[PDB]
């Protein structure tokens, strides 16, 4: 029954979650750049993800556009 507390707590934790997830993206990228050595990592889940990144990103692009048109055009 303290409305301001409810709104503030939900909003605050929402924002902190968002920032942390973006940070996850950034440091995964930093591992991709610096500490990745392909000699110890030959045929592998990470290797195969890198090896069909084009299919991955193309389909993610498609579904983004589909949701865009429908969800906002409504």
């Amino acid at each position: 029954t303290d409305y301001g507390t409810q709104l503030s707590l939900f909003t605050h934790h929402t924002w902190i979650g968002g920032f942390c997830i973006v940070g996850a993206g950034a440091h995964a990228a930093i591992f991709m750049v610096r500490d990745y050595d392909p000699t110890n990592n030959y045929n592998n889940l990470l290797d195969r993800v890198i090896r069909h990144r084009d299919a991955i990103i193309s389909h993610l692009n498609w579904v983004c556009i589909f949701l865009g048109f429908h969800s906002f055009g409504l």
Binding site: D54, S58, H59, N61, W62
Partner: protein, 734 residues
């Protein structure tokens, strides 16, 4: 492949990308850099293009006349114009629903018409139209004239009538004809129309193409003109008990000098406008005989430029050798033309809100708002163009050895002083203006509104007392009854001006106070800043210290890469690119300010302005928030009314604007990689790898996306503000 489009640039019609389409649309009017372009060919293409532009202008005006005459109600509007609204044109949209058309049908019409917030009705009622038939005749005439200009434009390209190069670059013979003919004779003929038609239509008569040859404009007629009794054309002018479209209190004069306004119509008298066009017709025709043509007595412009170098050498060579750069270059002349036309446009706006010329203007308020806002924004764009072509002049057409020691090289010698001092004034105005506004905000937010700085603008009030506004208790030069100027002008042209300047209901010399102080400083900040960006872009176009051979790249080049710390946005094009934002901001300030001051004037409480204009929350709450109540209620789950289209345009603007941010914030290469994965996807998809691109898809280039983002920013900005202004002012008073 080596495709046809476009034929002007061979290197452009070579690459297998989609860059050729956009660039072919972009370099079409860059005549100076096509293939095989000589100089004669350049001038001839420019000439024919001018004819094209004239054709389009006259055709457009014919269109306005035709639609007003056919779908409007100009025949009914002239009986009572403080009443039934103007009608622009009628709508036939198959997308409408029942309450939509039931709503839009307004102004006495029979279908979906929309109101004409353009001021054409007042113009055509003042100049002497009265019925539809005259408007149709005008439309047919202007369409015919447009066809004539189009044909002439085709004519002067045909190889027997192509003017040679030296027919152009003839300064002295073009100015005599322009100044005498184009200005003077046109002004004299317009005086003819005012005297013969517009005045007797304002007395009550139908002087048409029939029987204008048999009607005396003045009941004496060309006797006093050839005797030298000219003041007999001014005896017994129109009484102040006048009714405009009838003969009630009608006078007989045709050339007076009264000043002031019309007492019943709130416009300038027609006789004063006749006299004015007559006088400046004489002045321009006399001024048209200055220069030399195939005769004796004329001047030479080169001699005049040569002899004006001051002794003691405070200027090096003075104006030596300028005449061979004004004459030889086009971007210089275009820069001067845009500068003059932009300043004159501003002057048009500034005089037409305060001294309204047209009958029953300033009782249609939406007309005032749209006209003034329109001309202000036009002036802004024109001035920005002037400085842009200054920069193009420096890069393409400047020659140092021809300009060794004139003022043009002096300006390049000490440019750091210019940029420094423009930077200084911009900083000073910024700090103090923003500081005073923030201080007033803090004082208003806490419970104490008397603890805030409210400087009284005593200079402009001194000037307003100098013009005759007898309210500030200064008593000098026109407000004092024993001055020389007051007593000399008293007998004929003052008493109208004093009654028009002491009225607190017209727009002439509004009462001012501290809010006006603060806003005028904000405006000065806008002008100095925009001048800083543009002048810096122009003068640093030959080269900088970050790059001392910028002249080898041309006007609009992307960057110089990551080296030397990276040089994004280094071209002069990008300097102008940054300046456009400031232009939009500054005109935003002047137009917000004008609009709110006149809203509080037309509603009735100037106190609300003089109190809430001194702190930014006053603007946000009392202008943007309060006045957008009837706008966004243009449609709701309960219904809709007239201003639904505006309430849709109002969101449309935002959408364009926000899309504008995308091309600005997110630069290119990301999109290049995304488009490449798209290429893979369409290449390997079964049943859709049967359709290919003919020209390979690529992302937009670095220079282009700046232009596109700026286009979205400007278009969304303009549509949003136009929607708010029209909807708010016409929702309250309309």
């Amino acid at each position: 492949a080596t495709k046809l489009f476009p034929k002007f640039s061979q290197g452009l019609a070579q690459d297998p990308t989609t860059r050729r389409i956009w660039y072919g649309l972009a370099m079409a009017h860059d005549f100076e850099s096509h293939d095989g372009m000589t100089e004669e060919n350049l001038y001839q293409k420019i000439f024919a293009s001018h004819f094209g532009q004239l054709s389009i202008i006259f055709l457009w005006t014919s269109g306005n006349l035709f639609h007003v005459a056919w779908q409007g109600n100009f025949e009914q509007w002239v009986t009572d114009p403080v009443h039934i609204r103007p009608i622009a044109h009628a709508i036939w949209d198959p997308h409408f629903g029942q309450p939509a058309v039931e709503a839009f049908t307004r102004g006495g019409a029979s279908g979906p018409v929309n109101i004409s917030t353009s001021g054409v009705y007042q113009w055509w009622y003042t100049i002497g139209m009265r019925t539809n038939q005259d408007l149709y005749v005008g439309s047919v005439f202007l369409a015919l004239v447009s066809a004539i200009f189009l044909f002439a434009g085709w004519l002067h390209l045909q190889p027997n009538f192509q003017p040679s190069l030296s027919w152009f670059k003839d300064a002295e013979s073009r100015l005599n004809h322009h100044l005498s003919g184009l200005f003077g004779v046109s002004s004299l003929a317009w005086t003819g129309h005012l005297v013969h038609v517009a005045i007797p239509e304002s007395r009550g008569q139908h002087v048409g193409w029939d029987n204008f040859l048999s009607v005396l404009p003045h009941p004496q007629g060309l006797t006093p003109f050839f005797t030298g009794n000219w003041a007999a054309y001014a005896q017994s002018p129109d009484t102040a008990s006048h009714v405009f479209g009838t003969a009630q209190g009608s006078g007989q004069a045709i050339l007076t000098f009264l000043g002031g306004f019309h007492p019943q119509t709130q416009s300038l008298w027609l006789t004063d406008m006749a006299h004015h066009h007559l006088a400046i017709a004489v002045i321009f025709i006399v001024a048209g005989h200055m220069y030399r043509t195939n005769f004796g007595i004329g001047h030479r412009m080169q001699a005049i430029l040569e002899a004006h170098t001051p002794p003691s050498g405070s200027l090096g060579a003075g104006h030596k050798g300028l005449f061979d750069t004004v004459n030889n270059s086009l971007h210089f002349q275009l820069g001067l033309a845009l500068a003059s036309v932009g300043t004159i446009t501003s002057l048009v706006a500034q005089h037409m809100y305060s001294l309204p010329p047209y009958a029953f203007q300033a009782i249609d308020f939406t007309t005032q708002a749209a006209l003034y806002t329109h001309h202000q924004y036009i002036a802004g764009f024109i001035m920005c163009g002037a400085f842009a072509h200054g920069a193009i002049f420096f890069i393409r057409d400047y020659d140092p050895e021809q300009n060794k020691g004139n003022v043009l090289a002096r300006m390049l010698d000490h440019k750091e002083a210019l940029i420094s001092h423009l930077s200084w004034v911009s900083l000073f105005l910024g700090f103090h203006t923003l500081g005073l506004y923030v201080h007033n905000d803090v004082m208003q937010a806490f419970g104490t509104p008397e603890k805030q700085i409210l400087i009284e603008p005593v200079f402009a009030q001194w000037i307003q007392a100098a013009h005759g506004k007898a309210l500030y208790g200064f008593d000098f030069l026109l407000s004092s009854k024993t001055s020389a100027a007051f007593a000399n002008g008293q007998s004929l042209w003052l008493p109208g001006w004093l009654d028009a300047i002491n009225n607190n209901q017209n727009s002439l010399f509004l009462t001012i106070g501290p809010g006006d102080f603060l806003v005028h400083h904000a405006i000065a900040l806008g002008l100095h800043t925009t001048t800083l960006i543009l002048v810096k872009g122009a003068l640093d176009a030959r080269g900088s210290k970050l790059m001392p051979d910028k002249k080898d790249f041309g006007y609009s080049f992307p960057c110089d890469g990551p080296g030397r710390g990276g040089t994004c946005d280094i071209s002069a094009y990008d300097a102008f690119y940054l300046a456009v934002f400031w232009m939009l901001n500054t005109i935003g300030w002047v137009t917000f300010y004008w609009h709110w001051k006149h809203l509080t004037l037309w509603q009735g409480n100037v106190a609300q302005f003089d109190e809430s204009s001194t702190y930014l929350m006053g603007w946000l709450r009392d202008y943007l928030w309060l006045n957008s109540s009837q706008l966004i209620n243009g449609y709701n789950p309960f219904g809709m009314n007239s201003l639904s289209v505006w309430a849709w345009t109002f969101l449309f603007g935002h959408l364009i604007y926000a899309t504008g941010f995308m091309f600005l914030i997110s630069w290119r290469g990301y999109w290049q990689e995304l488009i490449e994965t798209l290429v893979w996807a369409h290449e390997k998809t079964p049943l859709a790898n049967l359709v290919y691109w003919k020209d390979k898809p690529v992302a937009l280039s670095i220079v282009q996306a700046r232009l596109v983002g700026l286009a979205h920013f400007s278009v969304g900005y303009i549509f949003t503000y136009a929607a708010f202004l029209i909807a708010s002012t016409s929702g309250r008073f309309g």
